[PDB]
Design a protein around this nucleic acid. Structure first.
Lengths: 64, 149, 114
RNA sequence: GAACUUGAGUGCAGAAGAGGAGAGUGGAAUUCCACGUGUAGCGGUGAAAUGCGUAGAGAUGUGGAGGAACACCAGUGGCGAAGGCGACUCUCUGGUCUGUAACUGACGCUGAGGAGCGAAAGCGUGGGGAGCGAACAGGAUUAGAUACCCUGGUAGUCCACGCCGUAAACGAUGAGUGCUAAGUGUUAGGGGGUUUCCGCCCCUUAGUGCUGCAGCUAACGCAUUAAGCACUCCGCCUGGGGAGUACGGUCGCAAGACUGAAACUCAAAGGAAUUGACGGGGGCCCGCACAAGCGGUGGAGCAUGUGGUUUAAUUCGAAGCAACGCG
C-alpha cells in the first residue's frame, strides 16, 4: 500500500492526535498491522508506541 | 466402479402388481417360485376373506407402516463408533419393508406361512406388529443419534 | 421482564446457556448435561440447540422476548443456539463474540501427548 | 630517526533499536473471597471414573485481594559478545550505523594463562505462592503401568543477595582483513534526475533473507552473511569402546564442574547419497477385499483327509496363506 506519514510529511506522531490514532486502531480496539495500514516500519513502530501511550492515558481503548 | 441397476417382472395373474412379484422373488427358498406363489396367493386370499377388502390396499397400507424413513449407518472415527442417520432412498424403503414382512412373518410361528404372512400383514396394517418393532426401533435409533446427520 | 441477555458458554465438553437479566440476574438456566445427554453427546451442537430451546422455554414465563446473545468459550454450538433462540419464539438482536482472551496472563496446562 | 592517511579512534551532526540496570504505573484473564439471580448438575475422557455439588455448585453482575507474563505491534523486523532481550514512563548508562571533513597519525588485530558474563535445573538465607508443576496420592488404560490420560498437589517456577558454572550454550560454521558474477525482498542512513511535495527511477553504505555464476565439496549444499581464493592469531582432531571413567589436583555448602589417562577390547564405528522393503506416514487406485445381501461352516450325526497316541507295521511324500475328500 501507500504510507500516510510519508504523504503528509509528518514526523513524530504526537499522541495528542487522538482522531488519527483512532483511524489506525481497528474496530475491536486492536492495532492494525502494517499490511493493513500501509505505513513504514519506523512509522508503524512509532504508531504502536503512540497507541500504547495513548491507551495508558485513556486516549485510546484496550477492549471494545 | 459406479452404480449398477436391476430389473424385475411386471405382472401377477391375480393381483397385477410389480411389488407383489417382488415379494414372490423374495421368500423363495432354494429356487422355488412355485411354493412362494402358492403361499402368496393363499395368504392374500385369506387377507381378502378375513377382512372384507381387496388385499392390495391392506398390503400397501402395511408397507406404508413398515417402510423406514431413516436408516442409521456407521461412521467410526477414532474409538467412537458413531452412527450416522441416513435418509433412505425409496427403493431401499420398499425392499427393507419386504424383508421385514418376510422375515418376521416366518419368524412368528403359526400353522402355515400362509397364515403367518397373512396375520403379519393384518398386524402391520393396524400398525402394531412384528416388523413395526423394527420400524419403531430404527426410528428411535435415528431419533437419539440425530446430532450427526 | 421483556429484555435480557443470553450468555452462551460452549466449551469442548459442555454448552451452558443461561438467559439472565441485564445487570446479571439469571431467569432460567439449562446445560447440555441438564437435558440428559451424559456422554460425549454433550459436545454435539444439537445439544446446544436443545439447551437454547429449554432456556428459551424457561425464560418466557415471568418473561422476556428480545434477547442479546453473548457467545463465550471456544466450542461448536454457537450458531445453532443463536438460531434456536429465534425459532423458539424470541428475537436475537446483538451477537457479542466474547470468549475470555488473556493477553499473556497465566500459563496453560501442558500439552496432552507429552 | 623523520613524514603521510587509507587501517584504528576522537570531533561535529543526525538516525534506529525488546542493549542494560533502578524505581513507578496500567488492562484483559486465571485463582480466591463476600453478596444478589437460581437449581442439579459440573468437570473430564478414546470410553469412564476419582473429584467438585442442594451445607447451593457450574453460569452470571459488582467489588476486593494477590501473583506472574506483557495480546494487537510482531515481521527469515531490530538490538546485544553470548546467554538473551517484546506494555508504558522517567533516572543513569553501553554499543552500532550513516554524512563528511576538523583532529591524532599505525596508536591495530589475535590472544595460552588470568578476570568477568553465563538459559534452565539445583543449592543457602529471608520472603512469596495466582496459574503451572517434578516428587507424591487416588481413578483409569493395561498381562504388568513406579508411564502416557484424568482429578489433586510438595519443592520449584517469582523477588533480593550469595553459590553452581553446565545445555543440541547451534549457523552443529572462532576472530580479523582483503579480493571473487548476478537477481531480489527487507532494516537503518545518505546522495542524484523532474516534482516544494506526493511518488518513481538511479546510486552508495552498514546490517538482514531467499534463489543463484565461477570456485569449493565425498555428496547434501555454501556461494560477497562462503563451506571460494589468501594472510595473521587462537582453540580443537588424529579408529570405536573402555570414558569424560579412575587416580591426583583446583574450585564447590552440596550436587558436581574442569584437567584427564591405562590395562583391556573390536576390525570396525561413521558421514553423505542410491536402489529397494517397511511405517500403528500422506495421496490416488483396484480385487466378493470392505460395505449391501443371500446361503453356510463352527453346535449334532456320519463320510473323508490330517495331526497326536497305540502299535509288528499303522509304508512313503505335503505342513500358514500356497499341507489337511492332497499324490
Amino acid at each position: 500500500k501507500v504510507c500516510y506519514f510519508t504523504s503528509n510529511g509528518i514526523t513524530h506522531i504526537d499522541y495528542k492526535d487522538v482522531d488519527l490514532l483512532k483511524k489506525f486502531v481497528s474496530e475491536r480496539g486492536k492495532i492494525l498491522p502494517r499490511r493493513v495500514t500501509g505505513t513504514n516500519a519506523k512509522y508503524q513502530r512509532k504508531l504502536t508506541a503512540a497507541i500504547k501511550r495513548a491507551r495508558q492515558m485513556a486516549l485510546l481503548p484496550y477492549v471494545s | 466402479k459406479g452404480p449398477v441397476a436391476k430389473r424385475d417382472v411386471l405382472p401377477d395373474p391375480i393381483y397385477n402388481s410389480k411389488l407383489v412379484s417382488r415379494l414372490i422373488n423374495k421368500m423363495m427358498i432354494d429356487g422355488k417360485k412355485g411354493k412362494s406363489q402358492t403361499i402368496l396367493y393363499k395368504s392374500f386370499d385369506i387377507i381378502k376373506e378375513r377382512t372384507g377388502n381387496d388385499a392390495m390396499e391392506v398390503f400397501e397400507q402395511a408397507l406404508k407402516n413398515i417402510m423406514p424413513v431413516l436408516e442409521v449407518k456407521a461412521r467410526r472415527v477414532g474409538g467412537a463408533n458413531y452412527q450416522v442417520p441416513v435418509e433412505v432412498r425409496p427403493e431401499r424403503r420398499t425392499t427393507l419393508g419386504l424383508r421385514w414382512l418376510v422375515n418376521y412373518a416366518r419368524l412368528r410361528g403359526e400353522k402355515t406361512m400362509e397364515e403367518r404372512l397373512a396375520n403379519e400383514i393384518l398386524d402391520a396394517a393396524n400398525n402394531t406388529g412384528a416388523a413395526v418393532k423394527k420400524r419403531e426401533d430404527t426410528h428411535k435409533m435415528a431419533e437419539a443419534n440425530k446430532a450427526f446427520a | 421482564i421483556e429484555s435480557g441477555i443470553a450468555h452462551i458458554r460452549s466449551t469442548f465438553n459442555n454448552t451452558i446457556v443461561t438467559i439472565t437479566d441485564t445487570h446479571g440476574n439469571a431467569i432460567s438456566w439449562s446445560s447440555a448435561g441438564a437435558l440428559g445427554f451424559r456422554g460425549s453427546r454433550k459436545s454435539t451442537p444439537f445439544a446446544a440447540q436443545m439447551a437454547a430451546e429449554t432456556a428459551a422455554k424457561g425464560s418466557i414465563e415471568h418473561g422476556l422476548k428480545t434477547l442479546e446473545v453473548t457467545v463465550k468459550g471456544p466450542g461448536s454450538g454457537r450458531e445453532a443456539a443463536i438460531r434456536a433462540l429465534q425459532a423458539a419464539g424470541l428475537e436475537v438482536t446483538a451477537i457479542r463474540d466474547v470468549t475470555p482472551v488473556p493477553h499473556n496472563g497465566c500459563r496453560p496446562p501442558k500439552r496432552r501427548r507429552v
